[PDB]
């Protein structure tokens, strides 16, 4: 999973993470520290076009929408 088509970004400054999505061939939702450490992959399955991403802050849930699978 690599930066091919980055789109959508949300910060979570309480835990110092940045979440972003990519709708490349190997689509995923990534995570990195706000200072550029702890790169990881959060979602990688059943995802094709993650245009949309956010965090609710009150419940601490990640939310996203897929344009292709339409969920």
């Amino acid at each position: 999973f690599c930066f091919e088509h980055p789109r959508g970004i949300v910060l979570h400054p309480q835990r110092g993470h940045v979440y972003w999505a990519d709708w490349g061939v190997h689509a995923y939702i990534g995570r990195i520290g706000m200072d550029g450490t702890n790169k990881s992959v959060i979602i990688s399955t059943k995802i094709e076009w993650p245009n949309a991403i956010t965090i609710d802050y009150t419940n601490d849930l990640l939310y996203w929408a897929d344009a292709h699978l339409g969920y």
């Binding site: 802050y57 009150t58 419940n59 849930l61």
Partner: protein, 141 residues
């Protein structure tokens, strides 16, 4: 043909039904109280972490208890008398801000009001706001 069946839980700890038991013509089957699930051994029960297993029960935040669960609200929100639905306590009413290509638009949460924040732009494809300085940022692609 067990001769003819009877409850097998009646004898002391046979099959070790952890919570509750019931029988049938030729077999038993244990059961667990609500908030407890049986695991693979088909004899014992464990607590449900409803805050992870079923997040939608609580509107806003959840705390797990052995058995049931309790819903709580983040600071700034109050729980309405239904016991699960948190309501925002600030007397500031939220409104949506979204971008069309040429315009940043202002829309109410219920959709009642609809106005332009700004117009004549190139192609605003993203925006975000800062509450500290009451400032708005956007990318004109």
């Amino acid at each position: 043909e067990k001769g003819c069946g009877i409850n097998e839980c009646l004898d002391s700890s046979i099959s070790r039904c952890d919570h509750n038991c019931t029988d049938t013509i030729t077999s038993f089957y244990c059961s667990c109280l609500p908030g407890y699930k049986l695991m693979s051994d088909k004899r014992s029960c464990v607590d449900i972490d409803e805050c992870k297993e079923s997040p939608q029960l609580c509107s806003q935040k959840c705390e797990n208890v052995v058995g049931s669960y309790i819903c709580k609200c983040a600071p700034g929100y109050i729980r309405e008398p239904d016991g699960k639905s948190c309501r925002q306590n600030s007397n500031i009413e939220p409104y949506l801000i979204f971008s069309n290509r040429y315009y940043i638009r202002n829309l109410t949460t219920d959709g009642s009001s609809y106005s332009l924040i700004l117009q004549g732009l190139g192609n605003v494809v993203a925006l975000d706001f800062d509450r500290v300085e009451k400032r708005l940022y956007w990318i004109d692609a």
